[PDB]
Amino acid sequence: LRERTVRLQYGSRVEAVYVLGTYLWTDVYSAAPAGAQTFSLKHSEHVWVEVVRDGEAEEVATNGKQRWLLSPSTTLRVTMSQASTEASSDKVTVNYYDEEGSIPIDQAGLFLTAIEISLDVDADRDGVVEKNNPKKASWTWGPEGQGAILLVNCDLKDMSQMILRTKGPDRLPAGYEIVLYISMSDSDKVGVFYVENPFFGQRYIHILGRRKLYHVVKYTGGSAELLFFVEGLCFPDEGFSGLVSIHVSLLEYMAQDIPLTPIFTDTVIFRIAPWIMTPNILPPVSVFVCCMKDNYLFLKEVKNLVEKTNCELKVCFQYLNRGDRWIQDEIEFGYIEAPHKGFPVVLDSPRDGELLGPDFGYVTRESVTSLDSFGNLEVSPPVTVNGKTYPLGRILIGSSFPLSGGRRMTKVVRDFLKAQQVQAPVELYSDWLTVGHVDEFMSFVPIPGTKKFLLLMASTSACYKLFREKQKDGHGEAIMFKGLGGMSSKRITINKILSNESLVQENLYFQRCLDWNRDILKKELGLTEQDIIDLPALFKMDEDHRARAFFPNMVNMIVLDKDLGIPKPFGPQVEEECCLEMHVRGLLEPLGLECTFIDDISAYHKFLGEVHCGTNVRRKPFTFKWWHMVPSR
Amino acid sequence: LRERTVRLQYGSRVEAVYVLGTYLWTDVYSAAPAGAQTFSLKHSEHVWVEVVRDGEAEEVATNGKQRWLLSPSTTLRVTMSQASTEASSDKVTVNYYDEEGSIPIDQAGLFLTAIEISLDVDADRDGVVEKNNPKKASWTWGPEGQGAILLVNCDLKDMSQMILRTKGPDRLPAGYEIVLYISMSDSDKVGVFYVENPFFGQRYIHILGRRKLYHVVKYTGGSAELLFFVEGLCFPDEGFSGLVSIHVSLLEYMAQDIPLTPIFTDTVIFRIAPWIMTPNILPPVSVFVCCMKDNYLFLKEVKNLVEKTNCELKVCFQYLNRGDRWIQDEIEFGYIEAPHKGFPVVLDSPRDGELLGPDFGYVTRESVTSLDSFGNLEVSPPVTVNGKTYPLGRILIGSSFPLSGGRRMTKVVRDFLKAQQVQAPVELYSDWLTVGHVDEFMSFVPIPGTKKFLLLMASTSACYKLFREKQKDGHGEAIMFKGLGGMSSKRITINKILSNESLVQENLYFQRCLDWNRDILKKELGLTEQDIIDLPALFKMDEDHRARAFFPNMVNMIVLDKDLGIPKPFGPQVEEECCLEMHVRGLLEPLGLECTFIDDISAYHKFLGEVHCGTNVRRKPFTFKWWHMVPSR
Ligand SMILES: [Ca+2]
Ligand SMILES: [Ca+2]
Numbered sequence A, B: 001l002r003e004r005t006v007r008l009q010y011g012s013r014v015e016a017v018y019v020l021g022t023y024l025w026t027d028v029y030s031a032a033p034a035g036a037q038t039f040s041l042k043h044s045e046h047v048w049v050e051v052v053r054d055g056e057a058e059e060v061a062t063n064g065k066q067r068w069l070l071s072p073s074t075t076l077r078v079t080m081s082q083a084s085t086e087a088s089s090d091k092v093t094v095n096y097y098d099e100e101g102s103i104p105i106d107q108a109g110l111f112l113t114a115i116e117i118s119l120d121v122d123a124d125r126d127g128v129v130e131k132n133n134p135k136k137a138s139w140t141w142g143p144e145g146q147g148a149i150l151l152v153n154c155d156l157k158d159m160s161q162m163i164l165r166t167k168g169p170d171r172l173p174a175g176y177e178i179v180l181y182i183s184m185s186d187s188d189k190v191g192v193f194y195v196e197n198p199f200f201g202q203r204y205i206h207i208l209g210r211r212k213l214y215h216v217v218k219y220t221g222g223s224a225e226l227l228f229f230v231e232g233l234c235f236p237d238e239g240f241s242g243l244v245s246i247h248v249s250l251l252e253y254m255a256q257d258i259p260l261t262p263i264f265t266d267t268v269i270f271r272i273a274p275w276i277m278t279p280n281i282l283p284p285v286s287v288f289v290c291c292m293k294d295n296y297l298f299l300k301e302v303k304n305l306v307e308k309t310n311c312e313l314k315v316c317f318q319y320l321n322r323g324d325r326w327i328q329d330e331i332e333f334g335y336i337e338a339p340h341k342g343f344p345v346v347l348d349s350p351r352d353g354e355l356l357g358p359d360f361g362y363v364t365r366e367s368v369t370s371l372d373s374f375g376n377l378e379v380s381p382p383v384t385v386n387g388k389t390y391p392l393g394r395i396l397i398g399s400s401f402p403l404s405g406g407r408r409m410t411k412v413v414r415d416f417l418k419a420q421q422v423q424a425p426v427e428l429y430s431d432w433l434t435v436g437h438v439d440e441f442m443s444f445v446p447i448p449g450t451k452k453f454l455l456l457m458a459s460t461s462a463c464y465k466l467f468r469e470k471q472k473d474g475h476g477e478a479i480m481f482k483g484l485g486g487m488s489s490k491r492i493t494i495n496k497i498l499s500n501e502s503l504v505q506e507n508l509y510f511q512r513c514l515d516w517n518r519d520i521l522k523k524e525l526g527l528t529e530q531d532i533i534d535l536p537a538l539f540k541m542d543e544d545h546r547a548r549a550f551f552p553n554m555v556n557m558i559v560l561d562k563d564l565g566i567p568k569p570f571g572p573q574v575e576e577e578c579c580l581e582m583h584v585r586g587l588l589e590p591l592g593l594e595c596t597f598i599d600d601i602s603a604y605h606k607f608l609g610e611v612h613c614g615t616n617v618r619r620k621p622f623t624f625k626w627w628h629m630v631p632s633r
């Protein structure tokens, strides 16, 4: 396919390595002695030679006596299809003649050693390293796309394989060597491991990476394969697309103090697999919770919920360097996948700077507000938006309005999420909340028995409507926070809430904030009102004009398929049941969702807007392969 | 198209601005008094109202008595198609009823003011700003692609136009304002100009850009248009794609110390036009030359060449802050184009840190080797490579091998050229040359009477073949450098050159360097041997093992269509003509190329490998529009 220039040298022999998959064009005119008129040629069995004049080519026999006029426009094309062995003498010889006699006045030779050199990866994405995929030097998205995929080492049987395959005689001819190399830029993105001395053992050493840009490879004769393992060192990010290159070159020695000439180069491209987040609709595997040792109702009720499922429960306690919610706030469960292998990968952002066990990879963060917590990071189910499908869903991050001067998640984390590309992040407005997390106002739940889902939204208007109804019904004196002794002296009733004029105005405003988010979610997730259910919520404004929960936010719930762990609201008691619990059941249960209310606050005797427990669910990855997506340019 | 949430408020009136191109979904259930059972509605002439229950919608008359059951799943959809005027009373009123009587127990209203707000650009790329192109919020490549294009101000009638078009009543309702804005990131990429006080004059002020991220716009009633002019501040580069965004928002006042809510936002995208280089095949306009005042033969011969064409000649002399070749080395002629306008743009990189006149834009550079000179920057004619078309050609930059430790053009300039994208740069190997410029070894020329072109390559093998022929013919004592008195004592003859064994070896090596480039050029430009002509050249090796010209390099030539200004080689005289001149004529003239040899060295009495003049040709731009290309992702 690729034409390489090799000229005969005046009255001499040229020796050259021929790399299979290329061919040579050979100038015979320049090596012709002055006064020479015509030329003839001989060649060996395994070398194919054409005489090319003005673009027109004719094959030549091994020993012909045929002669052609010498012209700069008459050249040779030289091709080989099989590697040289010790039995080979591969050559082309050209005889030169003057006008007078038929005995050659001079001759120029070309002696060839043919070798196969191919740097191979699994570009067709089946988990096997195929021989010389013609597409291995590029990377394309989609079901028809090709090029190899690399996993970040988040901690070598599970790394990517790269195989240098060669075929040839006992040794390379004098003056050649084979070198593997990478660019300085890619040197902090990858590393490559190799057994340098296979005669002395199995020991794999790092041959390419930080501080090592090239490695000279030992040539072995016959048909040989050299196995390399490759790891990614980092995820795609603001200035890094995820694509890296590795090269092998056959180098020719020229002279001392002159660099070696790269006479053949083969290239493979890898893309580093992105970090992917799992939405609530995916099958649960493990439920992780953190709380204080004595919150007994919480642990018992979570255990009972989990016992309704096939999931395993993992209990963590509170640590000195972490928040009360850390399993929710400082940890996010995600995954990476390559054709051959995949594993769960946790983003870890410790408050002050344990874990899950060996089955997980970990990405730990190297100015920060509450909006940096992973409570502020959510992901939608797969959605179609104006005809465009997002098969992995879309990441949702809470923010403030552009002109507001409000809080925002750090650019570093936003840039990281954006750079993964396959979840196409969307910013929502969370900064009207004191804590500032999207998970305080919204969640997703599957609809049992279907492939569909609902968006759940906190609604203050729903709460006021319900409370007004109960008051009309004669329940105005129904008290909230039953069983929280630290709330009792406040004597909070439906009447007291409904009569508070400033609280009404605060909550109308918070409903405007919720509705602004509702509109962004409908637009960017392609949802209609039929896809949404509102759950009652109520907030109190702080000094910053931001919202804190008046009673526990029910929307932030543990979703295990049909079973929902819902924070216990401690609402007004009507006929000895919480009217908030009954209302929420009436909304959800007709859909086949099973509700379990989980009391995370009783142990503290009161509720001031802060939650002291956290939960996080590890889920099975999407069955859709991320490399089958086609993201926008 | 876009659904916006507007809820009725319990027993009250809500007033809202309606922006045309959206519609409202309206909750009536939350505003219902406790105990209310059914509702009815009235609406004005220009407001369309549907009652929506469980996804099913039915239009409602202006005054109906129809009643519907109150349910959270029964809502209103509210649409307007025309802007409000002073004659409008646009409203929807909802009456609430209990089980008992038919007289309403309460009512909630919605009072609307409809306005049109559209931020408009020329997205369809015809030079006119069309009304609200649905595609203005994106940017796509190709003949079917859309989105607006911005020119860099390289120095406002020629800037891009952006028009804010509004329609509505005499004033915005209380609590609203319209604001134009950009991101902090884009603030150094753009600037926007506006007449802030049209009553006091025509004065245009900078309203958005560095240090100004937002501008409050004055609303005028009726049908109004506000004209803005937009400029790009910089070209695409390593961390900047070329894409920028400008937004207009309608903001709602909530309260003191609470940020304004962006209730409607419209966005336009601009792409900043790339800098594009012109190949030798494009029509010449002006020829620029620099030399010392007394190089008379040079000026006379260049003038005579130019007089064979319709081109204009511009003569520059030597300056203290610049090189002897500066018009070639420190200046590169290129262009930018937008649908409405285009102009030539010069890259200027002064050696130590005049010009062309007002018709040109200038980009001046803010560690450096010879490879940074623009002699080391070339561009191919349009080419097709493995089925992929490069309609603007491909930029060529000289470099050294990856593992060599050799010189390279600075990353800053390489990154810039790559970031323009439309010329898809290719690196060649120039570092075997002392000066290190691709223009020392290669050039392109059209084939007269056709749409085709040739690559010209320097060849040492061609020179040795020619000299060997002349020696065989009895011309061995023919002397070179005739008329250069400072060379005479050297007595350089064909015999003396051919007998120098080390010089032969040096030049065989230089031919290997040339051939390595030949192979890259054939591969990356999709050329065959039929596309190439070799011209004789000869070099001498320096202490760094790099090549300097033995006699002037003929390949670096002035190409004006069929007419070629070729450096005079001062070769061996045979029958009182230079055998190099005669040889080159014999190669080129049969193709209809007319050769004029230009003596740039006689004034210096000798030639040591350095050229003391420079030339550069300004050309007409490609007729193919760059935005019609589709570059690789
Ligand atoms: Ca494979
Ligand atoms: Ca989260």
Ligand SMILES: [Ca+2]
Residues within 6 Å of the ligand: B121, B122, B123, B124, B125, B126, B127, B128, B129, B130
């Ligand atoms: Ca237009």
Ligand SMILES: [Ca+2]
Residues within 6 Å of the ligand: B328, B332, B374, B375, B376, B377, B378, B439
């Ligand atoms: Ca140039």
